[PDB]
Subunit: 456 residues, 4 copies
C-alpha cells in the first residue's frame, strides 16, 4: 500500500527553498501523483543525533535527517560526488577514489537504513533513488526487510570498460542485485548494467528483463523520467516580474538563446561557450541582434573538479564578451545564480532558442521543461545534445554533437531563422511525446512493475 | 636650429594606424607645435638592412627603421618591457633580467645611433625619449656627437631601493649622465634619479645643475599634457549612429568609464574589485549604473601581460556572474582598441572617469577626460594618488587604489555629486591643463635645451 | 611476395637516433624477421617536395618523406595527437576537434598515398600501422590498389559510448572497412570496433569474417611482443662505469623502476600518489627503497602533454619535499630519454618493475622488464589491469591504478616477495612472452593476410 | 627595574616546541641575558577568555594568551601577514588591505593592552617587538601608562614611495611616535621611517637621533640583531645524529651548498633555484660533485601568497632535478620540513657554502649562524644577498644581487673553488663582526638607551 521514497536530496515543503536538480523535481512530481513518505537528507550538517524532522503537506510526508560534517564529506562530497558522479559520466580522469571515502559511503548507507527502519511497515513499497544509495537495499536486507524494494538510477550507467575501473565495482554490483527492481533512464543504461554484471558473474535471463545472479532474483526496466506539462504550461503563462516585463519589451528585436543548469562538468558549458563564439565568428549577421544567456548556479562547490569548471567558465565569459562585445551589446549573459523554477518556466516561454547540450546526461529535464513551456502558437526551438537521455524521445529537436562546435553553431543559426510552420510542427511533436510520458506515467509504470513482483 | 626627436614608438603619418600609448600622442603634439625630424622604429620586424623610410607631412619629417626578430626580442620585449618597465613601475617581482637581453639592449641602442648619425647636422638639438633609450646619448658621444642632447623619461623613475636591484643600474646611471638635460614627469622622479646617482658616486649641485664623474648635466620637471582645444572639438563632434542610440537608451543609467592599455601598472584587477565593493556596499546603484572598461592588449608577447589579461577576463566573468541580472550587465569589459577621436566623445558622455593606476608616469587619459567634458555639465574624475597627474589634478577625487572601499566610496560620491561641485572641480582641473598645454611642455623643454652650451 | 609496411613513426637505420615508442620497436622487430619496405615519416619538417629518402640495410629498405609545418600540425599534432590519441584512451575531455585538423588529417593520408603509389607492385602485401592512418586503405582503394591491405591498431579501440563522440566517427568506420584485415591488440579492442560498426550499419558475420556496406573484411587479435633472446643478451652486457658504481652503492637499497613516454595515458601522477601511499603506510621502507621514474617528453607541443608534465614536476618536488631526508631521496624523476640497450640492463638490476598505465594498448615496457630479468634472481612486475599486457602477464601483481592503496600494497608485497615466488612468477611470464615473440606476431599477421584473396 | 617584553610570537619554555623565526630566537637570547617578563601569544586559538598562562624558568617569566579564530584571522593572517609583511618587504602587489582586517588589527592591539595592564608596575621598562604591534604604545598611553616604552622593528621599514601606499600609513606613523624609543635593524630602516614621518608632518631633530612630531618626543636608533657565537660554536661541534654521521662519510667528495629559511616569498627561493640551475648550466664541471640542499619549513600556510610560493617551489624542484638529475645524482635536495636549530648548527659546520640570498630581509640570522658555526681552521663560504640587513656587517661574504641569477651562479662557483687562505680570512673577518655585535650587545644597547630617557 504505502509508498516510501528515499533519496539523498529532497524537495523541501517550503518550495522556493529549492536547489537546482532534476531528481527532486521528478520525485516531488511523482509523490504528488501517488501519495507517500519521503525520507532523505535535510541538506544540513551538524545535530545528526536529533530526531528525524517530519512535515506533512497533503498526501506527502517528509522525514529528514542531518548528516555529520565527516559523513557529508566522505559519503557525499568524496564518494558520491568525486567517484560515482564522474565515473558514471565517463570522467575516470576525475575520479578520486580513496578507501576512507568508500568506508564512509558504506557507513552512511548503513546509518540511514538504521534510521529508516522504525518508520517502515510490512506493507510498504520502497523506492530508492540514485547513485548515493547503491548499497541501500543490501543494508535493508541485512536488517530483515523483505518488502519490495525498487531502485531508480537518475544518471547514466557506464559501460564495463569504465565501470570496472571503480576499485569497488565488485561490491556495487553484488549489492544492486538485492533490489527487486532496477529502473534506468535509457535502454543503454540498462544494457550497460547487465553487461557489467555478466562480466563478473553468470546472469540467467529466462524472460524479457527478468534475471538471476548469485541466486538473487531481480528485474530491470527503462522509465525515462518526465515533467508535469500541464503545470508548467500554467506557470509559464503567469505574469512576468516587473523588471523582466521591462526587459522583454526592450529586447523586442533581439533573439534570445537561453540555457539553464547546475554548474557541472557533465553539462559541457565551456564547449557551449565555444559553440556560441563559433556562431559569432562565422555568422556576423547576428551581431547585436541575438543574446545568449546562461544561468548556472554553483553545485557541489566543495569538490575541486567543480571549482575548476567554474573558474574556467568565468574565464570564457570574460574572454568572449571581451572580444565580441560592443559598447551597447553584451553577447553573453552568464549568471552564476539560482533562479526559482516558476520563473524559469516564464523565461523559457519568452526564449527563441533553448540550448541544451550536456556532454553526458541521464535525461535532462530542462529540455522537457523548455518544450512544455512554449506557447504552442509561437514556440521556440530546442537545440539538444545527442548525449542527453532526452534525445531518445525529443527526436524532433535539433540534435547535435557538442564536441563539434561548428555543428552546434550551425544548429543555433538554423534555430534562429526557422519558420513558424517548422517551429510549430517540431514543437507539437515533442510536446506530444512528453505529454504521453508524464511524470505521472513514470511513477505509475514503476510502482505497477514493482507491485507486480512477489517478495522473497 | 632643427629639432631631432628619437623614440622607439612613433605616431605614423597615416594617423588611424595609431597604437595606444601616451608617448607618441605627446611627441606628435610637440612636433606639430615645433617642426622637426622624428627618428624611430617603424613598428615592423624583418628587412632591417633596408634604407630608412622617410615621409614628410607639413613641418614634420619621419625616418623609420625596421628591427630584426632577435633585436626586437632582446631590446624591446625582454629588456625594455620585461626589465625596465616592471622595475620602473615598482614590480621587481616581474623583472626578468638575463645577460643576453642586456647585451641586445646595448646592441640596438648602438645600432640606432649608427643609423641616426648620417642624418645629423652640427646645428641639431636632439631630444631622446623614454626607457628604451637610456644608453643613447652615451652611444652618440662615443661617435663624436657634441650637440645638445636632452632626454625625457615618460614613466616614473623608481627610488634607489628598487632601482639598485637592476643588475645593471650601474651602467644605466653612468650613461644617463651623458645627456645635457634630463627631464622627468614629476619632482619625485627627478629626486629619485638624483638619489640613485648619489648612492653610486659624488654629485655636486651648485645651482637643478649637476656634476657626476666630471660630467655636467641639468635636471628638470616637465609634466606632459594634452591639446585641450583640439579635444574639445573632437569631443563635441557627432556620435557614430550606433552610439547615438546607446546614449538615448542609457538616459537613466550613469556611466563609469575607464580606458587604458591592458598593463599591470594600471591596476585593473584592483579596479574591478573596487567596483565589486561599490556593488556590494551601495545596492541602490543596481541597475542604474554601468562600468565600462576598455583595455586593448599591449605587449601581448610578454608573459606578465598575458597573466594580467587572463586575470582580468576571470574577474569580468566573476563579477557579472555574481551581480548581473537578466537585463543588466554591471560591467562591460572590452579588450579592444578604440580610436582616440571616438574616446573623446565617450568621455564627454560619461558621468565618471575612473583612472586609478597603481603607478603611472603621468596618465593622459585623466587629462583627456577633463578636457572633453561639457563645461556646463561635466563628469567627475576619480584619480589614483600614484598617477603623475595627481600632482596637478588636485581637484579630482583622489584615492588610494590599494583600498578598494576608499575607491568605491569615491565612485559613490562621484555618482551623486551636485552640478555646482562638478562645475567647480572641473573648472579648476581644466584651467591647470590649459595652462600646462602640450605646447607648454614642448616649449619649456626646447627652450631649456637651447639654453645650454654644447661640449 | 614483398611486404610493404607503412607507419607514421619509423625506426631509423642509425639505431641510437631512436625515439621512445613501442610501434617502431615492434615493426623493426617484425621487419627484421620478415624482410621488406618501410615507408613512413622521416620525423623532419620542411622540404616536403624533395624525393623520398631511401636507405637499404640488409633485408629492410627505408623510404621516408618530410611533412610541411602545416601538415605536421593538422594531421599529427592536432588530429592524431589531440583527437584520436585522447579519444582512444578514453579522454574525451582532452579532445580538441576542429574541422581544419580533420581536413588536414585527410589531406595528409591522401598525400602519403600519392607518394606511396609509385613504389608499389601488384605483388605486394601492404601492412598499415596505427591511428595516424585510419583512412589510408580508402585512399589506396580510390587510386585503384587492389592488393591485400591489412591494418594493425597499436592502441586501444574505445567502446561506442566514447568512439561515437568523435564528430567524424562516421567516416572513420566506413574507411576502416576498406582494409582486408583489421588487427587489434586485445579481444576487447576488436569487439569494441565491431560494436561501433554495428551501431552505424548492419554487419554480417557468417564465420571473425565480416560484411558491412557490401565490403568484406576480417578481424583478429595479435598482441605485439618483444625479442626475448635479444634483450637477454643486452641486459647481461656490462653496465656503464657510472652505473656500475651506483649498483655497488645501492646494495642495501631496493629499486622500484618505471619507464615510459611522459603521456597522460600512463598514469604517472596516480603512480606518484601510490608511491606516496607506500611511504605513508609502510614507514619500514624509508631509506631502504627508491623509486626511479624515467619519462622523456613526448608530443611536447600538445597542451595536454605540457599540462601532465607540469603536474608531474610538482608531485616530484612535493613528495621529495615531504619524505626526503638529508641523505635519502625517495623518488628520482628523470625527464630524459634513455637508450633502450641501457634500459634493459637497468631492468635486470631493478627489484620491482612498476607499470601502471591508466590505459594502454599493450605496453612493451612490461614485457621487456620480464625478458631482462636474471631467471635465477628475478624482480617482480607490478602491472595495471588496464594494460593490454595484463591479458597475458597474468602472473604479475595485477592492480587497479585508481586505487593508490592497492598499488602501494602490491609494491610492498613485491619488495618482500621470496625468491621461490619470484622464480615461479617470472618463469610463467617469460614463457608466455617467449611463445608470443615479436616473430610470432609478424608471422601470424602476414600469414593471415597472405591467406585472403584480393578484390 | 623589571623588563617587560611583548611580542606576538614567543619561544616556549619547552624549547623543542619551537617554530622557525628569528624574533623568538633573538628575544630569548636577550631575556636570558637580562631577566624579565615575556608577554605574548601562546600560538593557540580558542579559549581566549581563559586566564593568562604563566610559567617561570630561571630569570624569565612567560605570560601567554590565546586568540579567537576571528582575531587570529584579522590581526595575524590578514593585517600582519597580508598587509604589513608584504608591504614592508616591498611587495605592494601582494598587499591585501581590507577595512575589517585593519579594524581587527586595532581591536587586538587594544585587547592585548587590556590584558597586559594588570601585570605592569610603575617601575617597568617595556619593550615591544615587531610589526604586529605598531599601535601598542598608543594603546598603552590611552590607558595611562607613562613608563618608558621602546619598540624594535625586526623587519625592514620601507621608503615612503612604498610605505605611503598603505591606506592606513597615516595612523601607523602617528602611533609609532607614542614610543619613547624606536629601534631599527639598519640605518636605512631608521632613515626610511624618518622620511615617511617627514612627508606627513614636521619633524624637529635638534640632536643625534632625537625627535619631535606633533609635540611628541621620541628617539630613534639602530641595533642590528645578533646571535650567541659561543653557544652555536658549542652546538655546531657536538656529535652528528648517526644517520647524518653516515651521510657526511658518503659525501666526502661532494661539496654541499646549503640554505635554510621559512618558506617565505621574501626569501627569493625560486630565484635561488634559478641561480642553481644557471650554475649547473654554465658550470658543467660541478655535475655529480656538488649538492644544493634547501630546507624550507612551511610558514603562514593559510595565507594565499604563501601557498602560491610553495607550489612554485615544488615545481622548480621537480623541474630542475628532472632536467639535470642522473640515475645516481640528485642535484637539488628540497625539504619542506622543520629542522631543530641545534642540528642546523652542525649542518652549517659541515657545509662548504651557505647560500643566503633573500630578496628582502630585515637582518637574516641564518647568515650569522652560518658563520658562527664554521670550524675556524677550515670554514665554508657565505654567499649573501645585498638586500639582507646582514650585508651591512658581513661585508666579507660574497655579496650578490639575487635578481641576477648569473652573478649568483658565479659566486657559487667562486665559493666552491676558494682556497683555504681566502676562506680563513673571509670567515675570521665576519666572525669578529658578529662576536663584537653579540645578541648580548644588542640587548644591552637597547635597554641602556631606553633606561636613559625620562618618562612623560
Ligand atoms: O537555477 C536553476 C537551475 C535548474 N533548475 C531546475 O533544476 C532541474 C535541473 O534538472 P536537469 O535534469 O536538467 O539536470 P540535473 O541538475 O538534474 O543534472 C530542472 O527542473 C530545472 O528547472 C532550477 O530550478 N533553477
Ligand atoms: O584604446 C585606446 C586606449 C588608449 N588610447 C590613448 O592612449 C593614451 C594613454 O596614454 P596614458 O598616458 O593614459 O597611458 P600609457 O598608455 O602611455 O601608459 C591616451 O592618449 C589614450 O587616449 C587610445 O587612443 N585608445
Ligand atoms: O627513455 C626511453 C623510454 C622508453 N623507451 C622504449 O620505448 C618503448 C615504450 O613502448 P611501450 O609500448 O611501453 O609504450 P608506448 O610508448 O608505445 O606507449 C619501449 O621499448 C621502451 O623500452 C626507450 O627506449 N627509452
Ligand atoms: O627549519 C628551521 C629553519 C629556521 N630556523 C631558525 O629560525 C630563525 C629564522 O630567523 P631569520 O631572521 O633568519 O628569518 P625570520 O623568520 O626571522 O624572518 C633562525 O634562527 C633559524 O636558524 C629553525 O629554527 N628551524
Ligand atoms: O543533490 P545535489 O548534489 O545538490 O545535486 C542535484 C541533483 O543532481 C542530479 O539530478 C542527481 O541525479 C540528483 O541525485 C541530485 O540531487
Ligand atoms: O610602444 P609600446 O611598447 O606599445 O607601449 C606604448 C607606449 O607606452 C607608454 O606610454 C610608454 O611610455 C611609451 O614609450 C610606449 O611607446
Ligand atoms: O611517434 P610519436 O608520436 O612520438 O609516439 C611514439 C609512438 O607511441 C605509440 O606507440 C604509438 O602507438 C605510435 O604510433 C607512436 O609512433
Ligand atoms: O610567528 P610567525 O608569524 O610564524 O613568524 C615567525 C617569526 O619570525 C619573523 O622574523 C617575525 O619577525 C617574527 O615576529 C615572527 O613571529
Amino acid at each position: 500500500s504505502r509508498l516510501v521514497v528515499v533519496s539523498n536530496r529532497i524537495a523541501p515543503p517550503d518550495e522556493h527553498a529549492a536547489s537546482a536538480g532534476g531528481l527532486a523535481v521528478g520525485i516531488l512530481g511523482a509523490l504528488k501523483a501517488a501519495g507517500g513518505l519521503w525520507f532523505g537528507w535535510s541538506g544540513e550538517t551538524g545535530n545528526e543525533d536529533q530526531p528525524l524532522k517530519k512535515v506533512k503537506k497533503g498526501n506527502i510526508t517528509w522525514a529528514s535527517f542531518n548528516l555529520s560534517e565527516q559523513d557529508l564529506d566522505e559519503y557525499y562530497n568524496q564518494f558520491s560526488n568525486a567517484v560515482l558522479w564522474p565515473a558514471f559520466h565517463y570522467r575516470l580522469d576525475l575520479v578520486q577514489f580513496q578507501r576512507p571515502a568508500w568506508d564512509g559511503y558504506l557507513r552512511v548507507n548503513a546509518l540511514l537504513a538504521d534510521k529508516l527502519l522504525p518508520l517502515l511497515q510490512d506493507d510498504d513499497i520502497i523506492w530508492i533513488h540514485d547513485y548515493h544509495l547503491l548499497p541501500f537495499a543490501h543494508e535493508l536486507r541485512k536488517r530483515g526487510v523483505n518488502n519490495r524494494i525498487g531502485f531508480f538510477l537518475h544518471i547514466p550507467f557506464p559501460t564495463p570498460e569504465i565501470f570496472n575501473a571503480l576499485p569497488t565495482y565488485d561490491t556495487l554490483l553484488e549489492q544492486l542485485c538485492d533490489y527487486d527492481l532496477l529502473g534506468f533512464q535509457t535502454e543503454n543504461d540498462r544494457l550497460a548494467f547487465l553487461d557489467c554484471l555478466s562480466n563478473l558473474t553468470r546472469v540467467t535471463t529466462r524472460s524479457a528483463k527478468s534475471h538471476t545472479a548469485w541466486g538473487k532474483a531481480f528485474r530491470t526496466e527503462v522509465y525515462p523520467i518526465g515533467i508535469e506539462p500541464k503545470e508548467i504550461a500554467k506557470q509559464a503563462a503567469g505574469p512576468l516580474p516587473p523588471k523582466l516585463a521591462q526587459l522583454k519589451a526592450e529586447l523586442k528585436n533581439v533573439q534570445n538563446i537561453f540555457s539553464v543548469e547546475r554548474l557541472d562538468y557533465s553539462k559541457g558549458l565551456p564547449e557551449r561557450f565555444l559553440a556560441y563564439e563559433a556562431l559569432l565568428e562565422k555568422y556576423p549577421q547576428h551581431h547585436g541582434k541575438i543574446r545568449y544567456t546562461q544561468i548556472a548556479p554553483t553545485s557541489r562547490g566543495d569538490v575541486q573538479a567543480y571549482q575548476d569548471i567554474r573558474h574556467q567558465l568565468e574565464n570564457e565569459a570574460g574572454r568572449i564578451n571581451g572580444k565580441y562585445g560592443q559598447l551597447g551589446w553584451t553577447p553573453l549573459y552568464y549568471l552564476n545564480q539560482h533562479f526559482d523554477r516558476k520563473l524559469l518556466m516564464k523565461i523559457f516561454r519568452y526564449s527563441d532558442v533553448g540550448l541544451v547540450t550536456p556532454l553526458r546526461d541521464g535525461m535532462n529535464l530542462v529540455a522537457k521543461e523548455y518544450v512544455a513551456a512554449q506557447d504552442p502558437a509561437n514556440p521556440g526551438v530546442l537545440v539538444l545534445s545527442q548525449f542527453a537521455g532526452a534525445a531518445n524521445e525529443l527526436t524532433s529537436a535539433l540534435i547535435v554533437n557538442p564536441y563539434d562546435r561548428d555543428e552546434v553553431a550551425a544548429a543555433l543559426d538554423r534555430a534562429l531563422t526557422m519558420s513558424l510552420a517548422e517551429r510549430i510542427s517540431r514543437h507539437a511533436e515533442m510536446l506530444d511525446v512528453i505529454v504521453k510520458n508524464d511524470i505521472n506515467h513514470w511513477q505509475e509504470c514503476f510502482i505497477s512493475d514493482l507491485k507486480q513482483i512477489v517478495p522473497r
